[PDB]
Amino acid sequence: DLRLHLLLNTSVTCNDGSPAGYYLKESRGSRRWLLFLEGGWYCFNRENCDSRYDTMRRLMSSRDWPRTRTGTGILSSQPEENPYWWNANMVFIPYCSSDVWSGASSKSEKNEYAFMGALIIQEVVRELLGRGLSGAKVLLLAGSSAGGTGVLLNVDRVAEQLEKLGYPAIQVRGLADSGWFLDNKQYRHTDCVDTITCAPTEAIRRGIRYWNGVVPERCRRQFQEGEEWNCFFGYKVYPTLRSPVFVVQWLFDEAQLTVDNVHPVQEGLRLYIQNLGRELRHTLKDVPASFAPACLSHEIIIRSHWTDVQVKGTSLPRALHCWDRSLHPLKGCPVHLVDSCPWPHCNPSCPT
Template identity: 75%
Template sequence: SVALLLICLVHSALVLGLLQSGAVGARRLRGGRSERRASLLPSAPHRQRGDTTTTESFALDFTAVEDNMDSFMTQVKNLAQSLYPCSAQKLDNDMKLHFLENMSVTCNDGTPAGYYLKESRGSRRWLIFLEGGWYCFNKENCDSRYETMRRLMSSSKWPQTKTGTGILSPLPEDNPHWWNANMVFIPYCSSDVWSGATPKTDQNDYAFMGSLIIKEVVKNLLSKGLDNGKILLLAGSSAGGTGVLLNVDAVSELLEELGHPNIQVRGLSDSGWFLDNKQYLCTDCVDTISCAPTEAIKRGIKYWGGVVPERCRLAHEGSEWNCFFGYRVYPTIRRPVFVVQWLFDEAQLTVDNIHLMGQPVQEGQWRYIQNLGIELRNTLKDVPAMFAPACLSHEVITRNYWIDIQVKGTSLPRALHCWERSLHDNSKNSKAPPKGCPMHLIDNCPWPHCNPTCPTIRDQVTGQEMNVIQFLMHMGFDVQKMAQQQGMDPSKLLGMLSSGS
């Protein structure tokens, strides 16, 4: 309609004006830096709508106006949002299913593996996400997994489209810095922590081809625009987060072999930094949940024909299972990796036989939980780029609330943005981290959910939300005793807990 067209023209003028004034402000702030950056600004709001021009998109990376970044970003995102109705057609933001061209690389049951893709034409940034979902390590628990969680072992019932959330969202208000990247989601159907290279045969009931699936997806994407890519971020959560640590160097080496050495490959590992510690209560290795992590991986790596990075394999020859644990494989990785890890990861506590809902937590369990946080902090202290909130949770980067969690006043998207800036600056031989842009963020407070921005906890029985004090009391936390141990008044301790100090 004419009215809608007029609204769009007005909005376009406003966006252009705002962005140009931002660019002028940036030149004043930074002494006229980057005329090319300013010339790209007006294209930002239009990259969403299927524009097929080849201009490189601008992913809301307003580093030049960092002194007034928050308000500037808010205005831009609000205006970009208001432009959505101006599209002649409904925005198609979903990722679409593609099966691999190489049909010999399959899911566990022999069905073809594949990936979901949402192209962002004009963008040279690619985000490839590895799904998580535990694993199985022998015929018995793989058979059980096939009966109860078939989509994690077969592509037979995958839907044709998938909607991206969190860092896979195409909406700038949900995903400030990566909304305009080419988005790829690889479903997990190999049950091998993305490590296997074994086909299904008459002798093998299942295929375990996780490492090969990743490589085949990358090869397929080269014909869909990745050949012109500049940055490839290999991300993943849970088993997918461990998969990032196992495969990020291999992806970079594959691209070099295929003649694309200029694509910068980086890793983002979410909730995949597990510890091989002793369980709180030792149990027999019967299934995935009860089996100690070390024992499960030892059995799994043989069953899957698991492949680990060459540098890590040489460092742990004869005990390659070590490479599935973040603090052991990380020092051998050559490409930059950002680690996101809850200090009190629910999956870690589960395999350690600490179950927080139901019966009140005993004092020994409480000490074990606090020690877990301490151990995790120690393994992360030399990781330059990481985000570790003191929360009881598991996975975050594809959650809708991923932008709300903060550590020391910095959000996860902001920390990732600082990391990207540091990599960009380092490529210009500047070793100093960006000023006022932190990317090594770890909570110091010692209890689960002592950070007030942690995601909401729900009582598993009633479904009701719990605040920090209710949660700690539910776990059998003795405020008086803890206050005595800390040498403080109980009411002061309660105040600190409720404020997250």
């Protein structure tokens, strides 16, 4: 079990002003630290944040959080369930800012909600340095879904933070799971009038202004004012990053299909789905550390059965271990694993 700690800096808050926090399970014989960012969509104006507060309140507030959480998947401490990093120090950071981990705005007389995701990550790192992170050799910032996008937005800032605090020897790395989205043509189209009709490009454009959102500096300098929404899309922000990042992405991700307005498949939709897999595979061609199976699913790394899926005969825990070795090609230890077959479940190891 991981144990809850609320942030001692009470100015760093969830959406409703309650303190943010993190769950921690220490491994005092280890110099490896895993910091995982939870996912779960976002909200981008007063009306849809209000609805989220009614029926998704654990993603907006710490008031009802439990004292412990059980580590699963890559956060498990049992080698049987986690062949990769079972002996690491484990941290789970709840997502209570609804801003894809980009916000830097407090609640105030002009802001009904606080959006502090980028500042929550910075403060968790600061407070952990007093609980053993000062002696780390590797800090892996990982995340699933909106938390995977959060890795891409924040990994270089954690690296910069640790250098300025005087810890240049800690190697900062990223692991982005199910957060590599395409701003592609939708299968059916709706103008942006309300939450369900707003495509991500338009929703994130509005969100950045509502959240006071921040993006990585080199990507910001490329796209400039009014176009920072581009940095929320992996294939555009990844080439600007200096930290090593491993990318996990299902080729037919269910969240991608939902934003594309896709729910007996005839020719038009068959061609649409095959083209989506082709484009995703193309965006990963020059990503040397990546795992991309031909499955219809969403998220993987905190699932207890994450060990079961394979690409070209190699599991995800093995590919991550091969990545570790490569950061000291390897015979029989690959790091770039992308399926080439063109339909969901053409890989027999896909989740049921």
